[PDB]
Design a protein around this ligand. Structure first.
Ligand SMILES: *[C@@H]1O[C@H](CO)[C@@H](O[C@@H]2O[C@H](CO)[C@@H](O[C@@H]3O[C@H](CO[C@@H]4O[C@H](CO)[C@@H](O[C@H]5O[C@H](CO)[C@@H](O)[C@H](O)[C@@H]5O)[C@H](O)[C@@H]4O)[C@@H](O)[C@H](O[C@H]4O[C@H](CO)[C@@H](O)[C@H](O)[C@@H]4O)[C@@H]3O)[C@H](O)[C@H]2NC(C)=O)[C@H](O)[C@H]1NC(C)=O
Ligand SMILES: *[C@@H]1O[C@H](CO)[C@@H](O[C@@H]2O[C@H](CO)[C@@H](O[C@@H]3O[C@H](CO)[C@@H](O)[C@H](O[C@H]4O[C@H](CO)[C@@H](O)[C@H](O)[C@@H]4O)[C@@H]3O)[C@H](O)[C@H]2NC(C)=O)[C@H](O)[C@H]1NC(C)=O
Ligand SMILES: *[C@@H]1O[C@H](CO)[C@@H](O[C@@H]2O[C@H](CO)[C@@H](O[C@@H]3O[C@H](CO)[C@@H](O)[C@H](O[C@H]4O[C@H](CO)[C@@H](O)[C@H](O)[C@@H]4O)[C@@H]3O)[C@H](O)[C@H]2NC(C)=O)[C@H](O)[C@H]1NC(C)=O
Ligand SMILES: *[C@@H]1O[C@H](CO)[C@@H](O[C@@H]2O[C@H](CO)[C@@H](O[C@@H]3O[C@H](CO)[C@@H](O)[C@H](O)[C@@H]3O)[C@H](O)[C@H]2NC(C)=O)[C@H](O)[C@H]1NC(C)=O
Ligand SMILES: *[C@@H]1O[C@H](CO)[C@@H](O[C@@H]2O[C@H](CO)[C@@H](O)[C@H](O)[C@H]2NC(C)=O)[C@H](O)[C@H]1NC(C)=O
Ligand SMILES: *[C@@H]1O[C@H](CO)[C@@H](O[C@@H]2O[C@H](CO)[C@@H](O)[C@H](O)[C@H]2NC(C)=O)[C@H](O)[C@H]1NC(C)=O
Ligand SMILES: *[C@@H]1O[C@H](CO)[C@@H](O[C@@H]2O[C@H](CO)[C@@H](O)[C@H](O)[C@H]2NC(C)=O)[C@H](O)[C@H]1NC(C)=O
Ligand SMILES: *[C@@H]1O[C@H](CO)[C@@H](O[C@@H]2O[C@H](CO)[C@@H](O)[C@H](O)[C@H]2NC(C)=O)[C@H](O)[C@H]1NC(C)=O
Ligand SMILES: *[C@@H]1O[C@H](CO)[C@@H](O[C@@H]2O[C@H](CO)[C@@H](O)[C@H](O)[C@H]2NC(C)=O)[C@H](O)[C@H]1NC(C)=O
Ligand SMILES: *[C@@H]1O[C@H](CO)[C@@H](O)[C@H](O)[C@H]1NC(C)=O
Ligand SMILES: *[C@@H]1O[C@H](CO)[C@@H](O)[C@H](O)[C@H]1NC(C)=O
Ligand SMILES: *[C@@H]1O[C@H](CO)[C@@H](O)[C@H](O)[C@H]1NC(C)=O
Ligand SMILES: [Mn+2]
Ligand SMILES: [Mn+2]
Ligand SMILES: [Mn+2]
Ligand SMILES: [Mn+2]
Ligand SMILES: [Mn+2]
Ligand SMILES: [Mn+2]
Ligand SMILES: [Mn+2]
Ligand SMILES: [Mn+2]
Lengths: 690, 924, 32
């Protein structure tokens, strides 16, 4: 039986298990010579080592908790549960993998929390209409998506130091509007006003008192307020098992980290809570602004969603900022648009429109693969995110966990989690690296040797450099090494030169750069393969001529990533829906489509072609998207029958087509005016006459 | 890599004074000594009424680490009236900027506040102080009569400062003009010659200064950082400044001329909020006498292994060329939240290799947030991205982060040992540390062994103790050293020799030293600097012909040498260090005489041959090329046989083929030495007679010059034998080919028009589009997908203008996207219009032709023609057989006429496509 | 058409009386 187990595992039980997940070992002394010890279970079964003498662990993933997915967010009976299972126990062998799966559901009537950061600087004087009767305008539009709503709010101006603060005439310390001979309020860094409550009564009254303050420079640094409202959850009132929305409303641009050096502020933000009993940021004057990275980390740990409620003059700005804090939404604040009272509920749709998985505390040895089943059993490899969802949908992720080699340590515990939700799948990973052979041995001393022999897992291992099979494999004899063994077939040189067979066991360990092992000395430990001048592309360790890719890398050379971010396009769908993602680069598979994300396709048919498929499945219960059940996921554009179609000379794109009933359907779609793509259909298609 | 890390000179100052916030060297011209300048912008002073005025200390390097305040100003606040201070020095951060030319010491106080002479205010204009040993002046170019956020009231000048070669001061202040920022440059002589202690707002002649701009530039913070260097023809240093809030928070870096503050060049960040331009540094890193720009973005978020944003920080290396152009590369941090680009400090030539070096600092990185400083060595290619040394902070946090590395100054050899040194500050722990450069030593070792081919029958040497007359040979080993800078003239190494290094793993060592009887030997050699390759001798011998094991494995003789690191610079023992990239050991091989014939010598016949299996490769692509090599030895044994595959400029090596058993897994490696890169492959030591090796070598070729016509390899086996030790050279040629998979694609939008048309009424003389009909748009695309490019091609469009003297698709306008000029043989838009089935295909219709001239399309470039036409409705509502369906057919063809690659078998590419617009009747 | 720098806000629209030139008025009564 010349297999991989019989080759690299004949040393001991420890190194036999590490050869392949398919190897077995024979502990007992049943025929302890002339027979292989690391062969498979079945080849160790015929040659009978059948009893507990066989050391053969198997990898497994046991589920320790899986509560059923809840139907509603009202905690009537037990609690809310949006992920199943909850605790898997992973038991892993060296170089082995074991796949499992997880289901995620955005339940309905989920309790929502809304904290409101108000810019109270002077620029906002012309912008405080929004805060007026807010709790009514938060309740009157969120009730449709949830009961059990809580609201609170705070305010921020800027750091109360120079060069931001008006300190110069003493009467400007208490009235920054000393000039203009007006009256406004003293400035403050961040003021917590109202803890999250359920009474819009006390809210609307507490909001109407608010008036503006004044400082010098147009940046206002609410990022100090964002951080404190995130990590002071005890003071803010963030509830467990509730959507957390942090709404940020401001007039102009914002200070960023390192700006405070102009103020003599050179201490980085520590991300800790510093609001005390006075409800004031006690380190506003001593601590720099927070960096985007620190905000993102804390915004994700505390499962907070940041909403940017900003004005037209500055919308492009935070829109560009939001791309750096993934999962944040922007929204215009002006009555010159369709919906301003629906501003937050429009955003909460976007937040819940996707489910992306995140990993915490992943052991460095482990590497996770991800399939994604987002719609109707349509498995998508390499995706840990499903998009286009609505509140209520349910998605499934299939997960693989593989370890390279195996670490010797206690059991670790990492978390697989939906972004922005309390519910999590905790994976207790234990590594079955060693056999039950070391403890079961006699002491390592006084055994088969003249002085200090150490053995008794399976074989005699006596002395250094000699290690006799019985004992004392010695210097030049021409004894048992007769080229019978020490050569895979006796028509070949001895032990794969780079080594000569002295006794039965050839120590071929001629000191090449790196290391050398293998019974017949065939293993390399280097010279695996090179993509650039680096072996395994620098992303993989070399094991007997084979590249063991590091986490997030695959391929014979370990030069192909698992990333899909470079594959994503601006619209959100990967490769713009016209290509496959392979090695982090879109391979566009579609006629006449090209570009990094297949965004360019001037030969592709006009949108009049796919949008008509949504007209047929939503309005006529007909077409191809109806057969594949994809109409409710793909057709999210609101369609309306509009009674002899409207038209303005303001970029209305008109489309027509002829259905199965020989009737000419006519429709136009007003391209995104508020991001919304609305679709207008004429009733009474042109049908023939009798 | 040569900074001494175990004997650093540590200086400390007052607690909570931010001692170490800024550092520089003091090299007075009236003293052979040198000093450390360290600012403490929060140190307390004897100035009356001034809480935390700040100091600048000079520190004696001799010994005892004494730091004493320089007295720039001992006075309190000047007064505007009886009890109405004119200035406020309390909490002014004096010393946050410190620069020193020869004897001038410029220190600044960027938070220095001022009560204007107009209204009671506190405006942080910032001040400076220039000391010339005896005379001390005040430089406050932002204390003008232009006072407010509107003007210079908040300029905070001296936030960043620097000197030029001609004693010009460059000063930055990021608060001028509603925080647009400002650069102000003044000659040093004018600063002292114009100083007037009774005048608060002094005008300096020859002042260079930026001016306020449009309000769009507010809050950009120009002057956050400054550096100087020449980026023009003149010898005059030009002005580099960081403006990290500029450009919608992308950040930018402005380069101004040194003569007249003219704008020269601009760098723009790639990522918002990253603080591109937090720091700048100018130095010549590639030894081309052209200053290079280094921009730091310490909050840069790059993509981790999983594609997730992580704040690691990024330093931008921009190499100046003969033209204005800059070759710019990027260099990312290593630990998250470490703030990698915080401080960038030129080192001069830390190793004296001939190329200048630089140090970048991640002051919040390291273990326990102690700080890290990475040393990067320059080379001819530019900066080497892999750091050669890591300076790790020693001090732990007390109240705030140590910030070790927040400030750094190099480029000055304070020990006068020939190598520059390096100060590093940590204002969180109130310390500053000076690292001294070690002297680099380049040692070349030789090892030669008398006859490599040992005959056991030939025993012409006696043996001590027993006189058996055994076979012997000699081992000679040479050692020479040389090193720049100060260095002891004689060095003491510890050389060690090992016989048969492949053995000693428990096998039998087959050679022993004669007198010592052992395979190991040691000796203390002592050499002098220079050349003079001083050698030594020893006598080793072989065991008995019937004693050890075997005769094919060769005797590897191993020499290693280690330098005893005493013999140091006598100053706390500044011990030297060996050159970084040098082998600390060399080894040669001796063979046993065996199967060499009666001539007593092995004379091989070496042959090499190779076939193509592809015979042609295409230009634009990266082609897999596998050469099948046959290396056979039909003569006597070949000691240390290796296959030498000399690859050309274009291609490189991938790996050996192991997917097939008919070929061999030869160990191969990519070598570069001595002006020629090549591939070596071990054929066996020895390569026995009649040995026929066969394997394949995978490659990847990319054409170098667009007119090359071929790729030639050269194959040769060579061996360490004395006679007949090389094979004939075999040159294999692979021919470059041209392949341009070009295709033309078309589409109509829409592709159907339904009749009748809504709100359509026949106008007498049609004027707009609504009076004519709907918009039919034909889009034609010519895309080159194949590897090879082309230089010229033609494109012809056939268009159905008329049928029976009746317009069909009235072309309004045609646009082009790409390298293409089009011309229509009939005037487009004669009427000046503002903003079964029957096929009509220009073979039965009046054809309007459009001819386009396509330029160079590369591997993935397209050329597109957009034809916006109107449906002539007046036609289709007539005895033009209304209720009859028509298919308006247009076609387009192309012919590729020219390719940039000459001397090559180009063959033409023609193809065509057709686009239809089916106008038909949906109802009667 | 006009604007201001810093923590700026249009003063108050009693248009045709208060603001010298301005370029807009409307809700909540603010100038251009
Ligand atoms: C590196 O990047 C830097 C930053 O992007 C570049 O610096 C910028 O370069 C621009 C190009 O030179 C330059 O724009 C020019 O600005 C001057 C400023 O003079 C003005 O004078 C008037 C009163 O003082 C005011 O202009 C009127 O118009 C503005 C709107 O622009 C109104 O809002 C005002 O009320 C006012 O009525 C300004 O306040 C300003 O002080 C202009 O004169 C120039 O005019 C030129 O272009 C126009 C076309 O629109 C022509 O008609 C005219 O004859 C000139 O050719 C430019 O607008 C920026 O000021 C400058 N910014 C900074 C901070 O340096 C830099 O050039 C670049 N370098 C390189 C090498 O790439
Ligand atoms: C330079 O000299 C100035 C001289 O004034 C010196 O400034 C002083 O620093 C001390 C710090 O040691 C300040 O003392 C503080 O006073 C405030 C009230 O004014 C207290 O609140 C401070 O904290 C106390 O209370 C806290 C909670 O209630 C406790 O946690 C804490 O342990 C204290 O008991 C503290 O006592 C003093 O106000 C200033 N004076 C000024 C600024 O005028 C400065 O430190 C010196 N700097 C250097 C580098 O030597
Ligand atoms: C049998 O084995 C013995 C082994 O001892 C061998 O005798 C040795 O041969 C070597 C070389 O084969 C001889 O040493 C030489 O000495 C002369 C000076 O008299 C040198 O010219 C030789 O070449 C060197 O020349 C320069 C020195 O002047 C060097 O710069 C150069 O690099 C060369 O090294 C060489 O050193 C000598 O005959 C002995 N030496 C010893 C130590 O025994 C004998 O040749 C073998 N015979 C057969 C038939 O196998
Ligand atoms: C990792 O490295 C390997 C090897 O260097 C890369 O594979 C090489 O590139 C492509 C992979 O699909 C293969 O295709 C070859 O190029 C032309 C281009 O038109 C193609 O049409 C042919 O099929 C041709 O075979 C190429 O053969 C392959 N080479 C080898 C030796 O396998 C791989 O792309 C690298 N991956 C990354 C992400 O860099
Ligand atoms: C992830 O998706 C792939 C998509 O094919 C699943 O299929 C495996 O694909 C790779 C290589 O083709 C291998 O793991 C197996 O050959 C495939 N397994 C099959 C077909 O059962 C893969 O199983 C998925 N993994 C997880 C953990 O869901
Ligand atoms: C400031 O100095 C620079 C160089 O010393 C001048 O740049 C040249 O000016 C002349 C005349 O205006 C032009 O013909 C050249 O093309 C300029 N050289 C360039 C742009 O590289 C500049 O004119 C000087 N004066 C200013 C900027 O006002
Ligand atoms: C002996 O020489 C070898 C080879 O020159 C060196 O050991 C390693 O060599 C590889 C390949 O050049 C390097 O990548 C390693 O970094 C070297 N090891 C070390 C520790 O640096 C080295 O010069 C010598 N090694 C010994 C143990 O004597
Ligand atoms: C022109 O383009 C056509 C695509 O319409 C291609 O024709 C292919 O090549 C030959 C010629 O008919 C056939 O073997 C293939 O089956 C064709 N494919 C088709 C018709 O789909 C080809 O790229 C070009 N052909 C010529 C003759 O120029
Ligand atoms: C527009 O009309 C033409 C001519 O009738 C259509 O061309 C048809 O294409 C099919 C292949 O799909 C071929 O059998 C013939 O060339 C045409 N059909 C018949 C029955 O003659 C063309 O498909 C029409 N356009 C669209 C969008 O359907
Ligand atoms: C936002 O980003 C876009 C490109 O992503 C850019 O064109 C635009 O100018 C940016 N605007 C702001 C205000 O950052
Ligand atoms: C070599 O040097 C070491 C230490 O410097 C010393 O112990 C040894 O005796 C020396 N040997 C000779 C031969 O000089
Ligand atoms: C198109 O015309 C312009 C000027 O008429 C010329 O510079 C350009 O080279 C032309 N391009 C081609 C592809 O003929
Ligand atoms: Mn406003
Ligand atoms: Mn402000
Ligand atoms: Mn210059
Ligand atoms: Mn240079
Ligand atoms: Mn150097
Ligand atoms: Mn030095
Ligand atoms: Mn011979
Ligand atoms: Mn404001």
């Amino acid at each position: 039986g010349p297999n991989i187990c019989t080759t690299r595992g004949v040393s001991s039980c420890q190194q036999c298990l590490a050869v392949s997940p398919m190897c077995a070992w024979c502990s007992d002394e049943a025929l302890p010579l002339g027979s292989p010890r690391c062969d498979l279970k079945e080849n160790l079964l015929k040659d009978n080592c059948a009893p507990e003498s066989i050391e053969f662990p198997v990898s497994e993933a046991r589920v320790l908790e899986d509560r059923p997915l809840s139907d509603k967010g009202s905690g009537d009976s037990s609690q809310v549960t949006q992920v199943s299972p909850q605790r898997i126990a992973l038991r892993l062998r060296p170089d082995d993998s074991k796949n499992f799966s997880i289901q995620v559901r955005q339940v309905e009537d989920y309790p929502v929390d809304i904290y409101y950061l108000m810019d109270l600087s002077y620029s906002m004087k012309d912008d405080l209409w929004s805060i007026q009767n807010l709790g009514t305008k938060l309740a009157t539009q969120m009730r449709k998506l949830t009961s059990n709503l809580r609201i609170g709010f705070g305010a921020f101006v800027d750091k109360p130091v120079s060069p931001y603060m008006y300190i110069s005439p003493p009467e400007a310390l208490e009235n920054p509007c000393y000039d203009m001979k007006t009256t406004c309020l003293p400035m403050f860094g961040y003021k917590h006003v109202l803890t999250l409550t359920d009474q819009v009564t006390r809210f609307n009254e507490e909001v109407k008192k608010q008036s503006v303050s004044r400082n010098r420079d147009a940046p206002e640094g609410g990022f100090d307020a964002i951080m404190q409202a995130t990590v002071c959850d005890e003071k803010i009132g963030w509830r467990n098992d509730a959507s957390h929305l942090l709404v940020f409303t401001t007039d102009a641009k914002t200070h960023i980290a390192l700006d405070g050096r102009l103020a003599g502020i050179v201490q980085p933000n520590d991300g800790q809570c510093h609001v005390g009993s006075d409800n004031h940021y006690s380190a506003s004057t001593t601590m720099d602004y927070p960096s985007l990275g620190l905000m993102t980390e804390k915004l994700s740990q505390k499962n907070i969603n940041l909403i940017f409620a900003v004005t037209e003059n500055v919308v492009n700005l935070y829109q560009n900022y939001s791309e750096l804090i993934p999962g944040t939404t922007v929204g215009v604040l002006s009555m010159d648009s369709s919906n301003v009272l629906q501003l937050i509920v429009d955003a909460y749709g976007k937040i819940r429109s996707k489910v992306e998985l995140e990993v915490r505390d992943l052991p460095e040895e482990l590497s996770l693969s991800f399939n994604a089943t987002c719609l109707n059993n349509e498995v998508i490899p390499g995706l840990k995110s499903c998009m286009g969802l609505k509140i209520g949908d349910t998605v499934s992720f299939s997960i693989e966990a593989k370890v390279r080699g195996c670490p010797q340590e206690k059991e670790k515990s990492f978390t697989i989690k939906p972004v922005g939700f309390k519910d999590s799948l905790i994976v207790q990973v234990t590594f079955d690296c060693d056999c039950a052979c070391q403890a079961q041995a006699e002491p390592n001393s006084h055994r088969c040797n003249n002085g200090n022999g150490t053995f008794e897992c399976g074989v005699c291992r006596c002395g250094p450099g000699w290690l006799g099979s019985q004992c004392e494999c010695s210097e030049e004899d021409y004894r048992p090494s007769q080229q019978d063994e020490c050569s895979p077939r006796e028509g070949q040189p001895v032990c794969s030169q780079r080594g000569e067979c002295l006794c039965g066991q050839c120590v071929c360990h001629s000191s090449d750069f790196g290391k050398i092992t293998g019974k017949y000395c065939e293993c390399d430990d280097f010279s695996c393969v090179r993509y650039k001048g680096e072996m395994c592309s620098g992303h993989g360790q070399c094991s007997c001529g084979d590249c063991l890719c590091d986490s997030d890398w695959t391929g014979y050379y370990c030069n192909c990533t698992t990333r899909t971010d470079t594959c994503m396009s601006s619209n959100g769908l990967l490769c713009s829906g016209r290509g496959k993602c392979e090695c982090g680069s879109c391979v566009c598979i579609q006629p006449g489509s090209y570009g990094d994300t297949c965004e360019k396709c001037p030969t592709c048919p006009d949108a009049c072609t796919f949008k008509k498929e949504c007209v047929e499945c939503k309005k006529f219960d007909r077409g191809a998207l109806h057969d594949e059940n994809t109409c409710n996921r793909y057709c999210r554009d609101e369609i309306e029958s509009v009674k002899e179609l409207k038209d303005t000379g303001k970029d209305a794109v008109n489309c027509t087509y002829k259905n199965e009933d020989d009737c000419v359907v006519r429709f136009q779609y007003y391209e995104d005016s508020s991001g919304k793509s609305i679709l207008y259909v004429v009733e009474e298609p042109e049908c023939p006459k009798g | 890599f040569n900074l001494d890390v175990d004997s650093p000179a540590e200086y400390s100052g007052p607690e909570g004074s931010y001692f170490g916030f800024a550092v520089d060297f003091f090299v007075p011209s009236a003293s052979s000594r040198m000093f450390l300048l360290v600012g403490a912008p929060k140190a307390n002073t004897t100035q009356p009424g001034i809480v935390e005025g700040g100091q600048v200390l000079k520190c004696d390097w001799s010994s005892t680490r004494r730091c004493q305040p320089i007295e720039f100003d001992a006075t309190g606040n000047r007064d505007y009236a009886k009890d109405d201070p004119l200035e406020f020095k309390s909490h002014q951060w004096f010393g946050a900027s410190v620069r020193s030319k020869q004897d001038k010491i410029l220190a600044c106080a960027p938070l220095y506040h001022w009560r204007t002479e107009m209204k009671q205010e506190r405006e942080p204009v910032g001040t400076c102080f220039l000391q010339d040993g005896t005379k001390t002046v005040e430089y406050a170019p932002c204390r003008s009569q232009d006072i407010d956020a509107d003007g210079q009231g908040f300029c905070q000048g001296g936030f960043s400062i620097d000197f030029t070669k001609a004693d010009r001061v460059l000063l930055g202040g990021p608060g001028s003009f509603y925080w647009q920022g400002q650069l102000i440059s003044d000659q040093v002589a004018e600063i002292v010659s114009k100083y007037d202690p009774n005048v608060y707002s002094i005008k300096y002649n020859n002042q260079l200064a930026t001016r306020t701009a449009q309000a769009i530039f507010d809050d950009s913070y120009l002057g956050y950082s400054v550096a100087v260097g020449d980026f023009n023809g003149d010898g005059i240093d030009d002005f580099v400044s960081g403006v990290p809030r500029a450009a919608r928070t992308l950040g930018m870096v402005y380069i101004y001329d040194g003569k007249n503050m003219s704008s020269l060049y601009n760098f723009t960040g790639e990522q918002m909020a990253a603080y591109f331009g937090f720091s700048v540094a100018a130095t010549d890193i590639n030894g081309d006498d052209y200053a290079d720009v280094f921009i730091g973005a310490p909050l840069f978020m790059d993509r981790g292994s999983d594609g997730k944003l992580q704040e690691v920080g990024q330093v931008s290396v921009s190499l100046q060329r003969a033209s204005g152009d800059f070759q710019t590369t990027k260099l990312n941090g290593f630990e998250v939240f470490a703030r990698f680009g915080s401080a960038i400090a030129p080192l001069g030539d830390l190793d004296q290799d001939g190329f200048n070096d630089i140090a970048i600092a991640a002051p919040y990185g390291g273990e326990d947030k102690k700080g890290i400083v990475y040393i990067f060595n320059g080379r001819s290619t530019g900066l080497n991205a892999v750091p050669s040394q890591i300076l790790e902070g020693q001090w732990a946090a007390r109240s705030m982060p140590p910030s070790f590395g927040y400030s750094m100054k190099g480029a000055t050899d304070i020990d006068k040992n020939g190598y520059p040194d390096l100060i590093v500050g940590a204002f969180g722990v109130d310390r500053a540390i000076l690292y001294r450069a070690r002297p680099v030593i380049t040692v070349n070792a030789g090892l030669e062994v008398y006859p490599s081919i040992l005959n056991q029958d030939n025993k012409t040497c006696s043996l001590p103790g027993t006189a058996l007359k055994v076979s012997c040979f000699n081992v000679r080993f040479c050692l020479k050293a040389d090193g720049k800078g100060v260095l002891p003239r004689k060095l003491n190494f510890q050389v060690e020799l090992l016989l048969d290094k492949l053995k000693q793993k428990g096998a039998i060592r087959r050679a022993l030293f004669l007198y010592s009887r052992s395979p190991s030997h040691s000796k203390n050699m002592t050499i002098s600097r220079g050349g003079l390759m001083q050698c030594e001798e020893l006598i080793a011998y072989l065991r008995d012909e019937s004693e050890f094991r075997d005769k094919l494995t060769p005797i590897t003789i191993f020499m290693e040498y280690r330098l005893d690191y005493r013999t140091a610079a006598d100053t706390t023992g500044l011990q030297p260090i060996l050159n970084q990239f040098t082998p600390a050991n060399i080894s040669r091989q001796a063979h046993i005489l065996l199967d060499c014939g009666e001539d007593n010598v092995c004379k091989p016949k070496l042959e090499v041959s190779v076939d193509s299996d592809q015979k042609k490769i295409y230009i634009g692509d990266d082609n897999p090329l596998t050469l099948i090599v046959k290396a056979q030895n039909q003569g006597e044994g070949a000691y240390e046989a290796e296959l030498i595959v000399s690859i050309p400029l274009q291609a490189d090596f991938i790996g050996v083929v192991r997917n097939n058993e008919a070929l061999a897994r030869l160990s191969c490696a990519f070598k570069t030495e001595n002006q020629t890169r090549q591939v070596v492959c071990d054929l066996g030591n020895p390569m026995k007679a009649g040995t026929q090796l066969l394997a394949g070598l995978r490659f990847s070729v990319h054409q170098q010059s667009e007119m090359d016509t071929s790729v030639k390899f050269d194959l040769q086996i060579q061996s360490s034998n004395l006679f007949d030790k090389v094979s004939p050279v075999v040159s294999h040629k692979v021919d470059l080919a041209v392949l341009a998979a070009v295709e033309i694609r078309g589409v109509s939008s829409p592709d159907h028009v339904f009749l009748p048309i809504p709100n359509w009424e026949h106008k007498e003389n049609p004027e707009t589009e609504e009076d004519v009909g709907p918009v039919v748009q034909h889009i034609y695309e010519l895309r080159n997908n194949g590897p090879s490019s082309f230089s010229k091609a033609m494109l012809h469009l056939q268009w159905p203008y008329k049928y029976n003297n009746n317009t069909l698709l009235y072309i309004l306008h045609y646009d082009i996207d790409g390298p293409m000029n089009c011309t229509s043989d009939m005037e487009i838009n004669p009427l000046r219009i503002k903003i079964d089935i029957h096929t009509l295909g220009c073979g039965v219709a009046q054809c309007l032709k459009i001819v386009c001239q396509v330029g160079r399309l590369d591997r993935g470039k397209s050329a597109i023609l957009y034809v916006k036409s109107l449906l002539w409705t007046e036609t289709f509502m007539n005895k033009e057989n209304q209720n009859h369906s028509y298919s308006l057919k247009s076609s387009a063809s192309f012919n590729v006429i020219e390719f940039p690659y000459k001397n090559l078998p180009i063959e033409d590419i023609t193809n065509s496509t057709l686009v239809t617009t089916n106008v038909t009747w949906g109802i009667q | 058409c006009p604007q201001g720098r810093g923590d700026w806000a249009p003063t108050s629209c009693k248009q045709d009386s208060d603001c010298l030139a301005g370029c807009v008025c409307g809700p909540n009564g603010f100038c251009g």
